[PDB]
Amino acid sequence: GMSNIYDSANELSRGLRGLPEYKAVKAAKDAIAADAEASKIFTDYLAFQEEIQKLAQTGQMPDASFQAKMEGFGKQIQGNSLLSEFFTKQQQLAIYLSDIEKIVFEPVSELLK
Amino acid sequence: GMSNIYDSANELSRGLRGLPEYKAVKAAKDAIAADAEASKIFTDYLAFQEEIQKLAQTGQMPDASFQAKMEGFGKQIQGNSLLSEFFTKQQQLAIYLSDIEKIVFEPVSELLK
Amino acid sequence: GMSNIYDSANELSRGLRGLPEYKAVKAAKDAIAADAEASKIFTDYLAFQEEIQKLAMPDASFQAKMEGFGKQIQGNSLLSEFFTKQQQLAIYLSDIEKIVFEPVSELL
Amino acid sequence: SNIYDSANELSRGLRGLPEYKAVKAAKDAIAADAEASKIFTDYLAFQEEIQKLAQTGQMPDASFQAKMEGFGKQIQGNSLLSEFFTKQQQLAIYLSDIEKIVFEPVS
Numbered sequence: 053g054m055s056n057i058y059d060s061a062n063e064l065s066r067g068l069r070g071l072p073e074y075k076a077v078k079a080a081k082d083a084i085a086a087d088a089e090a091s092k093i094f095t096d097y098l099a100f101q102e103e104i105q106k107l108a109q110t111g112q113m114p115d116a117s118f119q120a121k122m123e124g125f126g127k128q129i130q131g132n133s134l135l136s137e138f139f140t141k142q143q144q145l146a147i148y149l150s151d152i153e154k155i156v157f158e159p160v161s162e163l164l165k
Numbered sequence: 166g167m168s169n170i171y172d173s174a175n176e177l178s179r180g181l182r183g184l185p186e187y188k189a190v191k192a193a194k195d196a197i198a199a200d201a202e203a204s205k206i207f208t209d210y211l212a213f214q215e216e217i218q219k220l221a222q223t224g225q226m227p228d229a230s231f232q233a234k235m236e237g238f239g240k241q242i243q244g245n246s247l248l249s250e251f252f253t254k255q256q257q258l259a260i261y262l263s264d265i266e267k268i269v270f271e272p273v274s275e276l277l278k
Numbered sequence: 279g280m281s282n283i284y285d286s287a288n289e290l291s292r293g294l295r296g297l298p299e300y301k302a303v304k305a306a307k308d309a310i311a312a313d314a315e316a317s318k319i320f321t322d323y324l325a326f327q328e329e330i331q332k333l334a335m336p337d338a339s340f341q342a343k344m345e346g347f348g349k350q351i352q353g354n355s356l357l358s359e360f361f362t363k364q365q366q367l368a369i370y371l372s373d374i375e376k377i378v379f380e381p382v383s384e385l386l
Numbered sequence: 387s388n389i390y391d392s393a394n395e396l397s398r399g400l401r402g403l404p405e406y407k408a409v410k411a412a413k414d415a416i417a418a419d420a421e422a423s424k425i426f427t428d429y430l431a432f433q434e435e436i437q438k439l440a441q442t443g444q445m446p447d448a449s450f451q452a453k454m455e456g457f458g459k460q461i462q463g464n465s466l467l468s469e470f471f472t473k474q475q476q477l478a479i480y481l482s483d484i485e486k487i488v489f490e491p492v493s
Contacts, residue, residue: 097445098445101440101443101444101445104436104437104439104440104446105440105441107433107436107437107440108436108437108438108440108441110482110485111433111434111437113474114426114429114430114433114470114471114474115433115474115478116470116471116472116474116475116478117475117478119429119454119457119458119461119471120471120475122436122446122454123454123455123457123458125451126451126452126454126455126458127455129451130455136448139447139448139451140448142447142448143447143448143449146447
């Protein structure tokens with residue numbers, strides 16, 4: 053009953069970790085970590101995440117510094133094979149997980165109505 | 166392959182629907198839709214929640230007005246037994262839902278944190 | 279042009295710090311800092327702020343916890359003095375912000 | 387030297403900044419061009435999106451990074467947008483300082 057929920061959650065989990073797209077993102081993270089150059093840009097993009105929370109108090113007008121700074125980081129990612137691999141594999145996975153979400157939480161949607 | 170992932174996602178939703186906890190929130194939510202006044206407080210509460218979580222991106226505490234508002238909603242909830250039955254029962258369902266979140270969906274998102 | 283902006287800015291800054299409403303709030307926050315009991319409730323309440331992020335259906339757990347801190351606040355005089363005063367100040371500040379940034383508003 | 391007087395004096399100084407004047411000029415020009423205006427409107431909708439994405443703790447994904455990259459190209463390829471985004475950086479320093487100096491010591 054409760055066991056059903058956790059049995060199915062576990063096998064759904066295992067199944068997703070078996071996807072070539074999961075394998076690829078994880079291997080890609082490991083390759084960023086082994087690479088000085090990739091790793092440094094990743095760590096800085098990570099640190100840039102809080103500048104995005106700044107934005108959303110200080111953001112009625114378009115923030116030109118932010119634009120340039122985010123765009124800069126973008127171009128660094130595109131020019132680094134390890135980083136663009138990570139983000140494109142991550143994106144493919146999040147696409148697939150989003151359709152699984154829809155199935156899994158349909159009984160909850162039924163409760164918002 | 167992606168077939169068996171879908172089978173597992175479909176099986177997990179069934180389990181959710183099999184939870185007595187799920188069953189109890191569904192009965193509570195319907196009893197609220199039958200009542201025109203519990204619906205209005207419920208509707209009003211939901212808009213108040215989304216007001217609260219707009220403070221999520223300012224990192225500011227809820228002030229005396231939000232506190233005053235929540236006191237009000239809390240009196241309305243406790244003195245309306247359709248509302249109080251739903252709130253008590255949603256808490257019990259909530260644990261399962263956040264467990265599913267945790268086991269299945271959060272890991273892909275964490276790739277970005 | 280620039281010096282002007284910076285002088286007016288200084289003047290307004292010192293003016294706001296000299297408002298009785300600003301002082302009332304600073305004195306009330308200091309009183310919390312000096313009361314071991316209020317200090318802890320306040321700290322706890324600060325820590326509940328990461329839970330309104332997690333607020334990413336009505337969350338019953340959240341309403342109860344939030345309702346709970348509200349009552350802890352109304353039950354503590356130092357806390358209920360801080361929040362009341364802080365609100366009075368917030369209305370001034372917001373008035374002033376409207377004036378100062380009206381030229382930016384026109385840009386939107 | 388009361389607060390309303392200082393706050394009014396301060397906003398009039400803003401109006402007087404060449405940096406302000408240069409941003410108003412570039413916003414109005416943009417207002418009068420359908421091309422530039424829709425990108426502006428879209429960019430702003432996208433800022434909102436970044437802002438809401440923000441609070442999740444995540445990095446912007448490949449898709450957000452690509453949206454940003456698209457807008458970058460559009461701003462750099464459109465003259466009225468280039469003028470605005472450049473003049474906005476310069477004004478931003480003054481707006482920030484006012485925030486820093488006036489408001490955060492009482493908030």
